Amino acid sequence: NLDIIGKRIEKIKQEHETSWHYDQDHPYKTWAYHGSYETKSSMVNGVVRLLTKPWDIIPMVTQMAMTKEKVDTRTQEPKEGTKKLMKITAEWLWKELGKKKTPRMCTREEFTRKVRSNAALGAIWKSAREAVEDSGFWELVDKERNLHLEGKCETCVYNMMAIWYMWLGARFLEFEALGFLNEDHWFSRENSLSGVEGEGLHKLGYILRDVSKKEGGAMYADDTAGWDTRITLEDLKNEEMVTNHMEGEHKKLAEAIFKLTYQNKVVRVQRPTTVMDIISRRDQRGSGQVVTYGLNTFTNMEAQLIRQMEGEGVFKSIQHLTVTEEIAVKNWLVRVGRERLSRMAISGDDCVVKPLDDRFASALTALNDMGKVRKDIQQWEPSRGWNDWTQVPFCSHHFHELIMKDGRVLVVPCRNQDELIGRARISQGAGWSLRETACLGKSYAQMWSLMYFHRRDLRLAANAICSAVPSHWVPTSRATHEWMTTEDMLTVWNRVWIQENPWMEDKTPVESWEEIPYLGKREDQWCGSLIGLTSRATWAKNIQTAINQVRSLIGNEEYTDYMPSMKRFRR
Ligand SMILES: O=S1(=O)CCN(Cc2ccco2)CC1
Ligand SMILES: [Cl-]
Ligand SMILES: [Zn+2]
Ligand SMILES: [Zn+2]
């Protein structure tokens, strides 16, 4: 324990040995406190706001732009029968994910090419773009790397504000060892059967409708209360078994990431009473957001297969598994495992399960004992399922079935329109020029044109923003992002919804936006549309005046009018 984290702690001390003090009034109970040392928001996108004036008086939109007692919790060790179910399932799942994939190291080359097209996700030269073009950094990385091969760690200590930052070198070593899970699509639907990694928001609805076609009971979508805080050391150990599929240097590098950074963590914390606190713990999730996604999907897939086992009565008690209750679990996985993975859609901590029948709803003992406690339902109260795939929540959306005038079927993503408008009115960071603010507006607008075209207010506002931003300016931003392009949005729409759509047999291109349908007017209102309000009618009618206000601010540039794409403006 202390031999694994001592060097990291003993190092930090020496750099701040002029301010080192052990505070006896430290708030940490579940975290292990070591010492302290002296130490010391969302902006509005004006292009999007000026083109969404009716929403300036909608509190659900305007409040979105204004403005750690769970991270300090302790999970209990699972029973021996639980631990046995988890180890057997995890061993079988890594083998299945491994059947058509080859674990491999990710490279400095790959890591470099990622930072040079924006991929900063909790990091600590000025920027990471600079550090990667300087071999001094890479000598630091070499020093840490040879230390890992030696079963030791020096400079992999997280920074917590909960989001866990880590210095680029440690990030690199994590990417080198574990990047392959994301980079080679271990969690693709084709490869993992439950997964949706890389699927895209235009595919998730078709995937849920495919799950719905299976014979079985209700669709269950239970959210876990604080999934990252409920990751046990037993979970971390089952995740580590991916190294059993590796070899040579790779196996050793990955083993070190798991042992030294995941299973034996150390973290920096700002406390204003302002000291920096140095704390440690073994359990819970603390990795890069991208390795966190993949390992969340894995452990969630494992947990949901075990809950399906409990529902089907493959085992009777989590307290202890009989010898013949391991042969039967193993037989179940070999016999039906792949079929049961196909009954699920899993995106990290988020899941939809269509089990064999509704016994699943009251099968709670393994799920509770693994620590995956359901959010906003009493611990022993049976789950409430959905009868209609169009009502199931998944990845912050629901999905509509929308029939085109030509009879072809679209399955479209949707959420409350206040959420969509409120997010598009927000920018992250400082130093935004007018041009950069405009190009972020255009990214939102082209997303809305591709994903949310069926919402009357979003097609109109999308058209208005693309009319107000210079035609050739490139969309920016600091699933699959097909809207991030200067290509014509009708050509992109045809590629995504017709040409490349495996659920669409007839490949006849759509020739205008007028052939692309909306939700029913009543359904559009239910999902938050302002259609029918006086504020919205005056906005729609006078839209060219709003477009002209923004064009005057940006100045004398080349613009296109996209409003004639809509019938009411085609005049
Ligand atoms: O890593 S950072 O970009 C984000 C966190 N901040 C403050 C912080 C919290 C804990 C330790 O340090 C440092 C710079
Ligand atoms: Cl329902
Ligand atoms: Zn290290
Ligand atoms: Zn909807």
DSSP readout, 66-130? ----SSS--PPPPPHHHHHHHHHHHHHHHHHHHTT-------HHHHHHHHTTS--SSB---SHHH
Q: Which two tokens stand for residue 487?
A: 């290509």
According to DSSP, residue 382 is labeled: P
Q: Which ligand 1 atom minimizes the distance to the CA of 165?
A: 1
**Would you tell me how many other CB atoms lie within 10 Å of the CB of residue 488?**
9
Protein residue with its CA nearest to atom 13 in ligand 1: 159
Ligand in closest contact with the CA of 160: 1
Pairing of strands 158-160, 265-271: parallel
Q: By the 8 A CB rule, do 132 and 115 touch?
A: yes
| Type of residue numbered 475 | P
- Phi (first) and psi of residue 105, to 5 degrees: -80, 140
* Buried/exposed code over 256-287 (b: 16+ C-beta within 10 A; e: otherwise): bbbbbbbbbbbbbbeeeeebbbbbbbebbbbb
Which atom of ligand 1 has the smallest separation from the CA of 269?
Answer: 10
Region of 315 on the Ramachandran plot (φ > 0 left; ψ -120 to 50 alpha; else beta): beta
HSE toward the beta carbon, residue 272, CA cutoff 13 A: 1
How many whole angstroms from 386 Cα to the centroid of ligand 2? 4
Q: How far apart are CA 263 and CA 235, in angstroms?
A: 10
CB 83 within 8 A of CB 234: yes
Q: Which structure tokens are listed for 533?
A: 């309000």
Distance 39 CA to ligand 3 centre (A): 23
**Closest to 276 (Cα-Cα) out of 31, 39, 523, 531:** 39
Q: Tokens standing for 408?
A: 């072809």
Among left, alpha and beta (phi > 0; psi -120 to 50; other), residue 399 is beta
Over the range 331-342, which residues count as b (16 or more CB within 10 Å of their CB) and which as e?
Answer: ebbeebbeebbe
Determine which residue's CA is closest to atom 11 belonging to ligand 1: 159
The answer to whether the CB of 475 falls within 8 A of the CB of 442 is: yes
Name residues with Cβ closer than 5 Å to ligand 3, which is an ion: 144, 153, 156
Binding site listing = 144, 148, 153, 156, 223-224, 226-228, 296, 349-350, 375, 398, 400, 414, 527
CA 297 to ligand 4 center in whole angstroms:
26
Please, which residues have CB within 8 angstroms of residue 444's CB and are 6 or more apart in sequence? 45, 48, 423, 424, 462, 465
- Which residues neighbour 183 within 8 Å (Cβ) at sequence distance 6 or greater? 106, 110
Site to probe by mutation for ligand 1, drawn from 38, 124, 289 as the one with most ligand atoms within 8 Å of Cβ, is: 124
How far is residue 359 from each of residues 210, 351, 372, measured CA to CA in Å? 22, 18, 18
CA of 108 to the centre of ligand 3 (A): 17
Tokens, residue 55 = 């929403």
φ, ψ for residue 340 (rounded to 5)?
-75, -30
Q: How does strand 426-428 pair with strand 409-414?
A: unpaired
Instruction: Kindly tell me the burial class for residue 415, based on how many C-beta atoms sit within 10 Å of its own C-beta (0-12, 13-18, 19 or more).
Output: middle
Q: For residues 436, 441, 445 and 448, what is the CA-based torsion angle, rounded to 10 degrees?
A: 110
Q: Which residues contact 425 (CB under 8 A, 6 or more apart)?
A: 44, 45, 48, 49, 52, 55, 61, 64, 65
Q: Which atom of ligand 1 is nearest to the CA of 166?
A: 1
| Cα distance between residue 88 and residue 82, in whole Å | 10
Bridge partners of 123, per DSSP, are: 166
Check if the beta carbon of residue 186 is closer than 8 Å to that of residue 197.
yes
- Residues in the ligand 1 pocket, defined by CB under 6 Å: 124, 159-161, 165, 268-270
Taking the centre of ligand 3 as the mean of its atom positions, its distance from the CA of residue 266, in whole angstroms, is 11
**Please, which residues have CB within 8 angstroms of residue 330's CB and are 6 or more apart in sequence?**
88, 92
The DSSP string of 478-546 is ----TTSSSS-HHHHHHIIIIIT-TT----PPP-SGGGSPPPPHHHHHHTT--TT-HHHHHHHHTHHHH
Report helix, strand or coil for 401.
strand
Locate the ligand 1 atom nearest the alpha carbon of residue 124 and give its number: 1
The domains of the chain, with CATH numbers, are: 1-38+107-178+233-282 (3.30.70.2840), 85-98+188-225+288-393 (3.30.70), 398-570 (no CATH)
Are residues 157 and 8 in contact, defined by beta-carbon separation less than 8 angstroms?
A: yes
Residue 406 DSSP code: T
Q: Which ligand is nearest to the CA of 157?
A: 3
Tokens of 355: 């089990």
Treating both helix axes as pointing N-terminal to C-terminal, what angle do 135-149 and 248-256 enclose, rounded to 10 degrees?
90
Q: Which residue has the tokens 């070499």?
A: 142
φ, ψ for residue 535 (rounded to 5)? -55, -40
